[PDB]
Amino acid sequence: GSSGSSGTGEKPYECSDCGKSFIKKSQLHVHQRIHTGENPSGPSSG
Ligand SMILES: [Zn+2]
Structure with missing residues (x-):
């Protein structure tokens, strides 16, 4: 019911497109890779 990702100290190489580290x-x-090829979704892209 109430549970999810349980990991301390986030990991490096943090994806600057979604968050996946x-x-x-x-x-x-x-x-x-998936974050390349098509139009940059979201305003969080230059
Ligand atoms: Zn990503």
């Missing part, structure tokens, strides 16, 4: 660069690189 990662420990290794590669992990983020593979992700950021």
